[PDB]
Amino acid sequence: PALYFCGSIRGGREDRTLYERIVSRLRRFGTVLGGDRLIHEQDLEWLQQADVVVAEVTQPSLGVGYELGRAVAFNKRILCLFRPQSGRVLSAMIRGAADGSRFQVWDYEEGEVEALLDRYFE
Amino acid sequence: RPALYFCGSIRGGREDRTLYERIVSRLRRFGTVLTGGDRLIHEQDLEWLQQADVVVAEVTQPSLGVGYELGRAVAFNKRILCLFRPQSGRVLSAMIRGAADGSRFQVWDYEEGEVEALLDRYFE
Numbered sequence: 194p195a196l197y198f199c200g201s202i203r204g205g206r207e208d209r210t211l212y213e214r215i216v217s218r219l220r221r222f223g224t225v226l227g228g229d230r231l232i233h234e235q236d237l238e239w240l241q242q243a244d245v246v247v248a249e250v251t252q253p254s255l256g257v258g259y260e261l262g263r264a265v266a267f268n269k270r271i272l273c274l275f276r277p278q279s280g281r282v283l284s285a286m287i288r289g290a291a292d293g294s295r296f297q298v299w300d301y302e303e304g305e306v307e308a309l310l311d312r313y314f315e
Numbered sequence: 316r317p318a319l320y321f322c323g324s325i326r327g328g329r330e331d332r333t334l335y336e337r338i339v340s341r342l343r344r345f346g347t348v349l350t351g352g353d354r355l356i357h358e359q360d361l362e363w364l365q366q367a368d369v370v371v372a373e374v375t376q377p378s379l380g381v382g383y384e385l386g387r388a389v390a391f392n393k394r395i396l397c398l399f400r401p402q403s404g405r406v407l408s409a410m411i412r413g414a415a416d417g418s419r420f421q422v423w424d425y426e427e428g429e430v431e432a433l434l435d436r437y438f439e
């Protein structure tokens with residue numbers, strides 16, 4: 194099962210350590226998948242090849258949002274992870290895109306991310 | 316007269332709110348700016364996005380919602396104009412910079428004082 198992970202880079206790398214923890218756990222469950230144009234084209238190729246798109250959506254990021262919008266239109270299963278401890282109110286576009294099944298948005302505490310992913314990936 | 320959809324950060328931060336108001340004021344000279352909790356916001360916005368002739372986004376302040384709108388817009392094959400200010404000190408997302416094809420999806424770097432003139436040139 195092919196997995197695509199999204200998290201902020203140019204939006205800010207505040208959560209980089211957490212992203213590595215998520216990716217580490219995702220590798221147990223499946224394959225974790227020129228300038229900026231080449232980045233965009235390669236990422237779109239991988240998004241089209243994914244079975245599940247997982248996004249850590251706590252740090253606001255244009256690229257993460259864009260990946261999620263393309264993923265929806267590519268008919269992908271999506272899991273978004275948001276930390277209320279950030280003090281932020283998550284974007285209405287992401288919270289409102291969720292349907293609770295093929296697009297899920299979960300609030301979580303950092304210490305529990307491994308258990309949440311274990312649950313989601315059954 | 317085109318139907319227009321404007322994107323700019325809200326929950327990402329409202330740092331550029333006055334500039335967004337200037338952009339919308341100018342867009343209104345050219346066409347109609349189309350503009351249940353978060354679900355209703357998403358659904359109504361997606362209806363307007365499909366109706367829009369041009370999607371205009373100010374992409375300087377990072378925002379999940381603006382990025383999402385742009386991703387959905389690309390998949391709807393909308394004409395898209397993104398406006399970015401390098402004097403902000405930020406580096407624009409590769410996903411937005413790299414999505415540009417120079418015609419249907421354009422990214423223009425600009426200085427804040429010039430936004431009305433730039434919009435004039437695009438909608439001329």
Ligand SMILES: O=c1[nH]c(=O)n([C@@H]2O[C@H](COP(=O)(O)O)[C@@H](O)[C@@H]2F)cc1CO
Nearest residue numbers: 199200201202203204254256257408409
């Ligand atoms: O070099 C890159 N290589 C790349 O794959 N991305 C993709 O876009 C999102 C970050 O978007 P952002 O925060 O940078 O806007 C990530 O989930 C994913 F990493 C972005 C950049 C730089 O933009």
Ligand SMILES: O=c1[nH]c(=O)n([C@@H]2O[C@H](COP(=O)(O)O)[C@@H](O)[C@@H]2F)cc1CO
Nearest residue numbers: 284285322323324325326327378380381
């Ligand atoms: O109330 C809202 N009403 C709404 O239309 N949006 C749409 O999403 C983008 C901002 O995304 P964000 O920065 O908030 O993530 C805007 O271009 C556009 F405004 C967002 C929210 C709150 O999220």
